[PDB]
Amino acid sequence: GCGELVWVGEPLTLRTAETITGKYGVWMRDPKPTYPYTQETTWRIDTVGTDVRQVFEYDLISQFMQGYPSKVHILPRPLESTGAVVYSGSLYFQGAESRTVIRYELNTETVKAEKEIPGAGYHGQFPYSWGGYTDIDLAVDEAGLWVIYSTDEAKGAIVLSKLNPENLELEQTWETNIRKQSVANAFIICGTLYTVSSYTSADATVNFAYDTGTGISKTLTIPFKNRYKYSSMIDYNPLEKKLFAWDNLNMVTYDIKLS
Ligand SMILES: [Ca+2]
Ligand code: NA
C-alpha cells in the first residue's frame, strides 16, 4: 500500500561519525533483504576523500547505533558521491569519474554487472544544487530499482529510468521538465519522483512531484529541516517507509506521512 507524500519530519540521528572523514556519505538498509542479511542490516559509506572503497556493515541496529561494524568490504572499484543504494543483497554504486553503475553482491563480494547509463552526464555535469559530484542518484521504492540523472537530450532536466536489478538494463525512461541542478536532491515513492530544494542550508522543502504512472507533475511545499546544516544525501526506504539522510557527520532518518 502506497500513497502521496503529505508530510516529512521527526528527524532522528541514529549515529554520529567518528572522524571528519564521515562529514558526508551514504548509509542505507535493504528493502528486500536476502540471506544472510535482515531488515536490520545497515551499511555505511564515508565519502570524504578521493579514494572511497571501504563499506562498513552492521548486523544489528543496536550495533549500528553503539558498537563496531560486523564487517568491512573493500570495493574493487572506487565509489563516486553519495547516490548509492542497497537492494536485494547487492550494493549499487557509481564508478568514480564515470557514468558506470556497478552491482556489487555483498555476501560474495562479487561484481555482478557493470553498466554505463546511456547519454548520462557525470562527475560535475548534472549535480544537484549544492554540487558534490551528485550527477547520478540511485533509488529504491515499492516498484524496485531506479536511477535518477540527466542528459544533454533532456536539456539538463531530471531523467529517471527503471533499472533491471540483475543486469542494470534500462527498462523504462521518463523525461521531466525540471532542471536537476535546481534541486538539492530527489527520491522515489510509489513510482512518484519527489525533489527537494533548499532556501538555506538548514531549511528544505519537497517542492515538486512527477508521477510516472499518469505522467503529470505538481508543484509542492512540504517543509523539513536540515538539523546540522550540511546534507549530502537523502533517499527513501520503501520497507521502513522513512527518509534516510546524511547531514554533517550525522546519519539521520525522517518519518513521513502518505495519504
Ligand atoms: Ca536521493
Ligand atoms: Na541514492
Shortest-distance ligand to the CA of residue 136: 2
Say if CB 81 and CB 132 are below 8 A apart: yes
Ligand 1 centroid to residue 210 C-alpha, Å = 15
* Resolution for this PDB entry, in angstroms: 2.2
The CA distance from 227 to 224, in Å, is 9
| Domains of the chain: total | 1
How far is residue 117's CA from residue 11's CA, in Å, rounded to a whole number? Answer: 33
Q: Write out the residue range of the structural domain in which residue 173 sits.
A: 1-259
The three-class DSSP label of residue 197 is strand
Q: Where are the alpha helices (DSSP H) in the chain?
A: 61-65
Phi, psi of 10 (to 5 degrees): 55, 55
Q: How far apart are CA 93 and CA 137, in angstroms?
A: 9
Residue pair 67/104 in contact (Cβ under 8 Å)? The answer is no
Which three cell numbers, joined as nine digits, stand for 211?
A: 508521477
If residue 192 lies in a helix (H) or strand (E), which one and from where to where? strand 192-198
- β-strands 192-198, 185-189: how paired? antiparallel
What CA–CA distance (Å, rounded) separates 18 from 124? 28
Report which of 53, 40, 52 is spatially closest to residue 14, judged by C-alpha positions: 40
Q: Write phi, then psi, for 180 (nearest 5 degrees).
A: -65, -35
Q: Please report how many Cα atoms fall inside a 13 Å half-sphere around the Cα of residue 8, on the Cβ side.
A: 28
Output the CA 150–ligand 2 centroid distance in Å: 14
d(CA 32, CA 37): 10
